[model samples]
Target: HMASATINLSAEKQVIRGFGGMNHPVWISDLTPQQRDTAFGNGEGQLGFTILRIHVDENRNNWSKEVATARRAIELGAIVSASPWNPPSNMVETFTRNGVPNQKRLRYDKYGDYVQHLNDFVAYMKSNGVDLYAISVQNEPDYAHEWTWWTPQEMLRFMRDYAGQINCRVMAPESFQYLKNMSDPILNDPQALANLDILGAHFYGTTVNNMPYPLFEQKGAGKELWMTEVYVPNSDSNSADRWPEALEVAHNMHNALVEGNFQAYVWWYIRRSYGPMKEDGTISKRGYMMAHYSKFVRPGYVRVDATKNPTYNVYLSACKNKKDNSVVAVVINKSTEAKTINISVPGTSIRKWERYVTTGSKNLRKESDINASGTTFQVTLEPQSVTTFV
Candidate 1:
């Protein structure tokens, strides 16, 4: 028994959208009513996500696109949040036209104005009945690409100096490859970390454990860590359900939550050239990969004690839903051979409970199709499959 408690969920609290990954904002403008329905309407009963990370850039996405898709997402009862890799071309000092960040930092005066511009955008979103949750100072502060560049020391100073002018909470240290070399300095530097209300990092190269675990252990506890951007790629662009790195999905997600202890998780490229969903709007295996956690691990669910059994290739995380007496348990079988995992709910009193499993055939809405139930049952897990039982 893993001694974990599960709980009921109306909607998950922390699933956020990453705007402007595959399709540009203009593309969203052209979406038909049916397309919009297919994109978000499927979030019926199983904890609809209500947050988004809006991207702002004329080249990658224009204001019009963010505004357009945001309205659509908001209309469906989703919360809107904004984030940018680079400020506008003229406003940023070292960005190229190709969306890369330059190593040079913007002049302090220009940086101050950039903050103001973002403030104005926030006001713009609010005017449309959409409240902007938060905005980040830079997408990847460590990467001095065609976009704006801010070093660790510079980032610390920028937050310390100009963060006050922006009324919204400031998020920072979107480091490429999840390196702590950029964030650790600022976090330890009191003057730099003082103004920071939240801390977010993008997971691209290394696993979240390698990226955020050390940071979490280092901080006594002042800021929150977020798994801002992550995705598995199927480089073969032709397949209808093209997604590579399925194992990476389960491995990284577990690392982010169990190892990194991140409070929130967000995925990049919501609807892209190659996404988790098929062109027809049906969710692919990638969707199941996420549902293994998001579908069962509702908000307010506290992670309890659990351990990986050496005999089984399965990974587990248990959360007790405060709203209900249900305990949500998620298991990912990362092996090629089928393995049955023996689970023990050590933290809760419930001995026998219903199990709602999400696999290749079953998704969130079809809870009735649960494969197994009761205090104990053999989980006939297929190879390379992810499942959640609540």
Candidate 2:
């Protein structure tokens, strides 16, 4: 739950009027301790999530809320990363919402001050016993307007200067759509690329299968690739599946983990109306899709090799938790009509093993049901459904 969306106070009281604004409330500091615990805890008493994103606020009013919320995440034993969509209004040179920087302009002279203000935010949280795991130079540096703005060179300078000023690991080039060429210039430059520790990205327009591979080829930059955000709309305008009404989440998960090879996958939200669970935070089909990864995969489980035979509609990504000596496999069926699919373990492993299953009918919990002597079990995959068998 990256939480890059509505966690600011202003984001809730007024329409954020940006990418993450909608029915989602900017719930910074507003969630009760019980709610926060539930959202971040694993199925058991352990902490469920290890990371959370806190977007910085240029407006003074957002300061208190950001500080309170940030401290809470730290208290929960979760790592925190901060991002910013805007700089201070006093330093802006163009695109003013209220006599401030216009929606599509940048204030060149205020760049240093902008960094200071952002640093202040990091410092503020630190003063309250919160440690920021990482910080991005800017949210969408390619498209800056009405907020603090920057060109490639400007952002490069900011990153360079920030390297000396900030002590935490830097996550730069939070590019949208994985803009390879546009990003190539910044990531390729030795100075800018060296300062970066994590390579973060948001996937909106690009499909997982067709992304530009050149950027990933530059993995030597020594940064882990994280899928920062994604979700399904009610209409499935960009996808080929249903929305809040259907469980196309498995497709999205497969696209990120299997195709994209993203290590840490973050949903745009964890508690939105279209969230993986029912309104009560109980599990749904979408929740099961997430559980296939979050529940069984756990943390520190490296993805293993698996041959996904297309003859069956089920998609596959296997993982091995060497510490536990457990093998896990995730499978999904995106067909519109329910169909029974047969799956067999690849390689020379045992033909039969213990199986814990999850589906729309179950709450994504690890069911005790297992057919130890069977290699082929019939699964009625509903339209836009995902299942996990381990």
Candidate 3:
């Protein structure tokens, strides 16, 4: 028997904006119509992602294909955004390493031109019936190997001087590793802070504790924090058929919401060979992992405070739907032993409840209804699994 975990629905956190993945033109162009539906669909048997991120490629400025793909997702109620890996070749300086030109920094003299280049992409997308929700100035400046690099001072300079010239809301300085050095200066500067609308980061190799940006919470009440990109390698140590990667995705998402308080959690790719959906368009176990959240806890749901951890190796996060008074609590049991967990939402009423479990054997298996005894209910959690109570 496991101890009961008390969920306080009244303690509301950030209002969830949505979840999404990068729709690289190469990948989107390869997806069939049916596969595309599986990615952006909000109805039954889909990964109901509400945000669609696309790369703003200057190398291939032929934007029609990418625009059409983004337009499709937008028509399905997904917010579209773009990030650039580099500006135009002429607008940047480069260094030759091993005989190949490597991007060093944007031309200091072409700062205004670089901003215009970004603005042009945004304008083109809007003209094509796909209005972007926001645009990032750069993808991951701090850890750019093949991409352009920008020092913190350079980013602050651009944000202070040119970020506001763009027609839409602007996200900034996407830290590849969520580095404080990359984002802190922008938060500390008044003009730069005023220009930045969303604080975006990529958690390639970072822990959950690094997610909390207290300054953003204190000074950026109106702004949003987004985990823009991540991809967990297959656990097979040989092949992509392993189920453990799915469980790992769930845990990372749990920490992104519970610990980071991120409004949006976007993965790196949607349907790559190792993504949530594989190349063949079949939803991978990792895809089912995302369904545990995207299928239910939708946009506009506020993450209410809940028991952080009910027991050892057990994690909990809950969100309440604003449109309806319905609540969804997701519990992950990572231990090797199965345990019965008693859950309750105090100061709120749960008349009817449904449970969905995704373990090694089950793929989002829907179980019978659970009855709440005076706002409390008991459920069995299989070892190393994710369960959602709605």
TM-score of each: 0.80, 0.76, 0.95
lDDT of 3 at 293: 88
Model 3 residue 75 lDDT? Answer: 82
User: Model 2 over residues 104-200: C-alpha lDDT tens digits?
Assistant: 4336666667667767877777887777877777776665543444566766776665554666777666666656643565576777677777666
Q: Rate the local accuracy (lDDT) of all candidates.
A: 0.58, 0.55, 0.83
Best by TM-score: 3
TM-score of 3: 0.95
Question: Which stretches of model 3 miss by more than 4 angstroms?
Answer: 27-29, 95-102, 233-240
Please rank every candidate by lDDT, starting with the best: 3, 1, 2
Candidates 2 and 3 compared: the better one by lDDT is 3
Colliding residue pairs in candidate 3 = none
| Prediction 3 global C-alpha lDDT | 0.83
* Tens-digit lDDT track of model 1 for 272-332: 4444445555555555465556545644566655553324566776566665556666677
Residues 19-61, candidate 3, lDDT per residue (tens digit)?
Answer: 8788886535544678778888977668888888888887654
Lowest lDDT 10-mer window, candidate 2?
9-18
Mark the regions of model 2 whose C-alpha exceeds 4 Å error after superposition.
Answer: 1-29, 44-47, 67-77, 95-101, 104-106, 143-149, 234-246, 277-285, 336-361, 365-384
Deviation (Å) of 12 in candidate 3: 1.0
Top model number, lDDT:
3
